[PDB]
Design a protein around this ligand. Sequence first.
Ligand SMILES: O=[N+]([O-])c1ccc(O[C@@H]2O[C@H](CO)[C@@H](O)[C@H](O)[C@H]2O)c(Cl)c1
Length: 305
Amino acid sequence: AKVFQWFGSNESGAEFGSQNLPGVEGKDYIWPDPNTIDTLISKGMNIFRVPFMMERLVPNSMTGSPDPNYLADLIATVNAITQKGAYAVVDPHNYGRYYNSIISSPSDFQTFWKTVASQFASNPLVIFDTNNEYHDMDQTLVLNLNQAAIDGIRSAGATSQYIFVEGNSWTGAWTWTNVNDNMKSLTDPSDKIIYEMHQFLDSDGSGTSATCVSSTIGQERITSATQWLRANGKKGIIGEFAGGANDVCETAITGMLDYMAQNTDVWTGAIWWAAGPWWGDYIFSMEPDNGIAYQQILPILTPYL
Ligand SMILES: O=[N+]([O-])c1ccc(O[C@@H]2O[C@H](CO)[C@@H](O)[C@H](O)[C@H]2O)c(Cl)c1
């Protein structure tokens, strides 16, 4: 049936308006629509990544208590995804930073992660994602933060769940081998680490242009990462990727996914960026029924579902 272990979409919105903390639900940010998630599940997607802000979930100090109202909506979003059998990725979309400062204390980060994991420890369809897109920060620190997250998660008794770890350089697949080699050393008593890498297809890899470099750029940019995963005995996932609704990008997307389908010994699947209810005319919107990617990219993703 399905080609990959996991194939689905980011469900963005709870991390919107990040300049406004705590911000106001329904004004600065919004949670995903369970009904449009239901539509994507019906099409065959089985994984939904849910960005949220660390500061909204655990304000002021990451070692403190959660904010009950924001936590309630995270739980509602997650448990609805998982009630249907799909996996829900809990993603503190924080770039290795808390109140815009590098998270320099692995012990504080471990406590944050025990707190979060304790809210989901009996749900085997939750996936914990240590942090979205570490960047511009010490490389040993990135390793140590990922390890601290794992340690906190497992200390909470959340042992059935996969943990998505992310590297430096915005966890890019194309820069993985030269930047993130030290990530090979991460340890997990559950043996459920997945190396989450992101790959955009525009000139600079920022995912801000709908134009892709070429019809083969996706395969090109993930090839070395694929060899690093295999040689190091690791498993990976593409946790964010996108291209514009045009021929070159559509061919790049197909070529990337086809290459990944030939390498499922290491690639567990792929997650599109992004669906969510506040994208409007976003160049990559996967939100049913009118997102441009839902209209023009989903027909090329269904062959893998
Ligand atoms: O590796 N690079 O040469 C490179 C990586 C990332 C870049 O831009 C960032 O891309 C992120 C997504 O891949 C995005 O979230 C972030 O906002 C961008 O700054 C560049 Cl330009 C280059």
